[PDB]
Symmetry: D2
Subunit: 475 residues, 4 copies
């Protein structure tokens, strides 16, 4: 039942002297163990990847795309088998975990076909000066080299594949460092690439304790690019450890949902509840605060309340909407935000209840900017409603956040919604819909402390490629 998992290192499956046992956050069930790599074993992974780089980058785009398509087919075949373990490993609903594996296969296939249509440009010297009119630049794309991909606990397969496939199609070699709570899933994803016959050293995995290899994996001079999803403080550290090297960071969010007086309140409540409470609010791109005009606030709060009361609260195996949080510390942190809001006079529209790390969904009304819940990312099923008098106030409060991932605007006036969107300091603005990363072909980025670089399949490919210009004179 509980297997001893191994790392993919240069086409071989390796155990380490020490290991980390992984337990199901909802039940405490032992799921297996992953290797606890040393720095010398991380060196072996990077040496194998740099050695494999020359033969991988010289393959055709077609040949590289064929491996990715083969990996995605194996993921679709084993979606139930991987989804069942993923569900237990990060306390995600069984169906939602299987959906994550299917979405990963879709992103791998889309990146394989997006990346193979890689084009260059021909520039004319005569565009700038007459004397150089016979000079042209043949500009072609090249891989950056070794990409270190760091996936998060909440999407350990999906936000590993969204980094791996775009890097691999471009001719880069990859080392996946999954989170410890999610490493069995990351290694199951690696088994699909290994079964697809990915050449030795082109795709590898690293698992271990942050105290032994956390900074080491990023600082290493073999790494040419770091692609990470995780907390803002960890991302801030990765940015300095990267030095001059290119990075892509997907960090926290405190996405606001601005509801104007002319909004469809039932549609706004439906989207706000689905977005805020999806995976018990353990998503960076979740709706984390409602900024509603006071005229429609009482009716909107009542409609959000009725929907929050319907949400099922239970175990991942029963596909509950609200499942247990990733760990005790996460649950304690969420309870502290709920306590601060209650003590400062916010109205609890739905009751707080906690059984283990299973916190019931809490909706708060009359939330003010002096409450921690107005600003701090909970990663838990708690949503504040902050009443505003003007749209200028809603923009001001929205932009006062250190985060700027996405925003939602619920209104029937789209020219005004576009004007508001221009002023919001976020990557994406959704009109009459919850904030969301999808569709995966769209750009996904965060302003301020929410990230660095632009994600979305083609943008991820462009970010993990460089340019080689060949200039010559026509005679």
């Amino acid at each position: 039942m509980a297997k001893q998992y191994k790392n993919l290192v240069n086409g071989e499956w390796k155990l380490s002297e020490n290991e980390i046992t992984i337990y199901a956050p909802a039940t405490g069930e032992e799921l297996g163990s992953v290797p606890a790599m040393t720095q010398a074993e991380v060196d072996a992974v990077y040496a194998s990847a740099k050695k494999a780089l020359s033969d991988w980058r010289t393959l055709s785009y077609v040949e590289r795309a064929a491996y990715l398509h083969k990996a995605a087919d194996i993921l679709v075949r084993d979606a139930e088998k991987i989804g069942a373990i993923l569900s237990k490993e990060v306390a995600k609903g069984h169906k939602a975990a299987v959906s994550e594996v299917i979405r990963t296969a879709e992103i791998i296939n889309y990146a394989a076909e997006e990346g193979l249509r890689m084009e260059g440009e021909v520039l004319e010297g005569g565009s700038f000066e007459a004397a150089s009119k016979k000079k042209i630049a043949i500009v072609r794309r090249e891989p950056v080299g070794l990409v270190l991909a760091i996936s998060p606990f909440n999407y350990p397969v999906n936000l590993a594949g969204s980094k791996i496939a775009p890097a691999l199609i471009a001719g880069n070699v990859v080392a996946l460092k999954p989170p410890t709570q999610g490493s069995i899933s990351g290694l199951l994803l690696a088994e699909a690439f290994a079964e697809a016959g990915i050449p030795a050293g082109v795709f590898n995995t690293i698992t271990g304790r942050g105290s032994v290899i956390g900074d080491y994996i990023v600082e290493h001079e073999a790494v040419n690019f770091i692609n990470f999803t995780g907390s803002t403080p960890i991302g801030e550290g990765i940015g300095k450890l990267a030095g001059m090297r290119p990075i892509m960071l997907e960090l926290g969010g405190k996405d606001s949902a601005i509801v104007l007086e002319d909004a469809d309140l039932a549609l706004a409540a439906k989207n706000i509840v689905a977005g805020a409470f999806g995976y018990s609010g353990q998503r960076c791109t979740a709706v984390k605060r409602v900024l509603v005009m006071d005229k429609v606030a009482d009716q909107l709060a009542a409609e959000i309340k009725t929907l929050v009361e319907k949400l099922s609260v239970g175990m991942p195996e029963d596909d509950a909407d609200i499942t247990p949080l990733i760990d005790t510390s996460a649950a304690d942190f969420v309870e502290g935000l709920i306590k601060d809001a209650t003590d400062k006079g916010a109205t609890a529209l739905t009751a707080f209840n906690r059984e283990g790390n299973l916190i019931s969904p809490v909706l708060f009304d009359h939330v003010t900017t002096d409450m921690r819940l107005a600003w701090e990312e909970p990663f838990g099923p708690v949503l504040p409603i902050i009443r505003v008098t003007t749209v200028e106030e809603a923009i001001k409060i929205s932009n006062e956040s250190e985060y700027g991932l996405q925003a939602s605007i619920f209104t029937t006036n789209f020219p005004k919604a576009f004007g508001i969107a221009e002023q919001l300091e976020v990557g994406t603005v959704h009109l009459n819909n919850k904030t969301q990363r999808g569709t995966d072909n769209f750009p996904f980025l965060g302003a301020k402390k929410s990230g660095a670089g632009v994600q979305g399949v083609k943008y991820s490919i462009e970010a993990m490629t460089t340019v080689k210009s060949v200039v010559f004179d026509i005679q």
Copy 2:
């Protein structure tokens, strides 16, 4: 005629309590003084810029382009006046300094017209999944915010304008930090933008001592992007101080010129000498080592020697090819590399002579890779010739360098030259021509320790812009 220069801060010209006197490196003549800003004065510059940002980004592209065109016209008008001071300030030939100011005006005009044709994209949700076929993403470009532009001593006007105009057209606000040896020229460039009527706070300058404001200007939370040209160690430090913030770094080069057996040796010698000895070798994109096939090495060295002996050695006012180096430390460093090469048995084809900081051009043959001159960037008029037996050896020696700015290949076999170019770890490869940044519409980038990001007018605009996606469903 030594003037007391002032910094452009929020539409006003400000002196500081302390100042730095600038002297001509070739004669020791006092040229004037620039303010020695405090950290509180840097805070005032950044506060002015962030305040000016909202009204600047909301202007049309046409309005922003008009200011850039007006400033470029003022630079063309005052090219002799600016060029005369620039020549004395960095010991650059009088005509070459005037040419630099004219080239700056050309880049400003090209960036104003490139940036105003800024386009977005419309993506279809139906490209990724059938359920999202009515969902579209209107993706538009936005400024990153405040750009800190740091120009180098060797191109204090040209590599200030190449950062300022692309940032300004995109709707960013700028703070120019010129080098101390080059700050009078950076402030003369600022006077052209001020005379063009650039709004208060949109364009500002900072001058000061590295011990007082060096790290402070970069670390400051108001700065959203750092665009720097200078030494590799300084750029490495900037990368760390930037944290997660976007950067563009133009650092050192050790550009190799690979000469094959079928090369036109007279053309190779002409290009190699013009590129290696331009501005006494004080350029990052300059031929710094010749990797020549042994069969043609004696004839190529003889042809390079005859041309190096013709180079004039003297003062900037007399438009000498070889002028005095930027400072004593730079000339001492170059002399040390010449000494190491002589002591290790390299053949000096042209004699070493030094008068103050005026070093005569030294050509070395039979340079082996145990010599410091084979690897270290001198920033002086010294060129090694390294003989090889195979093109595999030339590629291996060229790639062993920590730098990878550009490379030159002299050969009549272009399909082979393209194959070699693919293997060279550089940004740009010039076929049958010296390495060069131009034309300014072409990408300019460095692999390895030569930089971060892609320069060239459109690439600079793209780098200093982000994306704002607005997603909605069609009904």
Copy 3:
């Protein structure tokens, strides 16, 4: 009244015969233009094909410099050119000067858009592994000789919108202005000649359609025909072009769909400005209002009050409604007004005609059996058609043989976008009148409204081809 000459191979040439041009509003003689023979058209094309090799080999910067100098000369002489243009096509004095300034803007924008011309590098390895070392260096090239045919209503603006995009790309051009508008077209040519455009690179042709009409188009020297004018002439040009590339800007019957939730005052303001601009003598003009019956009475009343305010008079007095281009045009418009009156449409503003000066006529209760519901008048007459559903509005809008542009006045934009997807038009304007601008935007027509896509960058792409150079890397 001067005797104008054609620009042919850097020289100014008269022909044996000439055509005298009169002001449509006053009958004043403005001058004459040459009446070229087919042999003189041959000389223009021989000059252009000879000049093509040295023009296409110039840098993009050198070609852009000539365009910028021509645009500067147009700005300098905008009052001088605009004054003659105003008299020549009975356009308001200020509107005619604005047209010359807008032409200089398009020329400059084309010069800077075209010089940033880029190619592409394609990888053989994208399609098959065996061709991974094979790449294609794809670069843009001119099509060759472009014949540009401008219309009477925009004889300078819709001549420059064809000439500058063609010239920046390395093409040589022959401008054939309309006879009523040839003095303006030749004044535009004087600006390019003063800018020092090389001999044969830019030339003009003037003459009678019965002598050279089909001849200029069917000539084998012409590689591309870029025309603005009537649909029947455009249809003929398409056949005469054979396999050669074309760009056609033809008739319009633009609809303004007004929904129940629309801002009716804003809809009326935009509808009147768009429908009655230059007395309705524009292809991109609101030519039919398709309004929901619940809001039709109030919209009709608001359009009426604004139509009654429009000044009716002479071009020199900057009147909103000026005399029509010719008697035939005014007779045709009067016939459409008569047909609507006889079929029971309600004339909300009175019909009056003094010479070829027709007062603006607004009709309500227009049905699909009336000619005014379908035919392009090119006159100051606007029908209002009442509809019960948006499906009916889409159906009636698409039943037209034209599909240039449409306007949708509503506060529901997701629905407006859904309606826009169903309309068979090139452009849909939300809460605004139909318009060609801004000139960087695409401008095209579906069905009988055109062929090809205009707008500066689109015009450049259309009048260029590609040259692919393929080789294997070793």
Copy 4:
């Protein structure tokens, strides 16, 4: 020998009359195809216009899935389709199977290229400050009904290269294969029908040119004609199209310019493979060698040795030179051989004809007064023309009415690029024979060789239009 049917609105239909098809190499009866009437063509087009709305509103992913499913069926049945295709157009068995596999590759590539279709957002503030709040959301759209006309020499490959790019973009298609090749076109249609392509989305038309030839092109339901075939037929299609968009892939007389510094063995190998592939029945074949006199004797001797090694025989034996498509084609080739012999050209390989199987003829000392220097033979005959300067080679190359592709064999690449700029062709191959591939690369012809740019992404762009939605941000 089966009785084949046309795919019409999801049903397989016979016509009252039929055309029996015979193998050009053996005379074997292969089956019959319907001889459609104009009323049956009307039914095909009515079905397609009706199916257009539900096809275009499907997602790109759903349209791509049908194309991928059709391509998989073609790979599965590649031997079955290839065996019939080989007999139908006297193409080698292995080459005919390869054609089906290449068609599946193009269908898959077009499905994935087309689904990443993007629009653009343009800023009014790029052109004028007053329009800075105005933006244009420009999205791609199908042109409507595409009539695809495939040629006899690539009846499956140059049917799929038109069908898949049109279908992914949301267009509906009617395939008109050539009569000699209609069984193969209908076998391709069976793969799309088995893939479950919706009724009316994809249809076929078969018939006699005297009954429906002009009718299929003239029909007002057709919005785009994509044709590969002879130049005179293409010229007629261009007129019949009127203002409607077209894509024409017509004749070629591709020149292979061999300079003094060329690798003559490489030049001979590529020249012979390109000139004699499918007995020279290809528009992209090398059809004339323009060689510098200093290296002409050695090059001709090297080409001769390779031509003498070409097998001459039947398609079932994978012979290099197989029987020509029909008697008329072989008679025409024999006439060009006769004109060259009578005018003094040197026959380096002997002329022999057995039925319509012509042996490969190599001619040297071919002059510009011989028909073989200019006319496309579509037969295994190649002239070698000697030139004294590269200027003469460019002049002779460009004197041709065709301009499909050119080859340049030389070791001086910067000079080869300079020559390529002067050649009036779509593509120039350096040190390699002319060829359409890879299918992601642009494929086009200058002068009488075509209209429009083919190659997968270029095909998709050509069979799409643009819909601009403009609004002001508040």
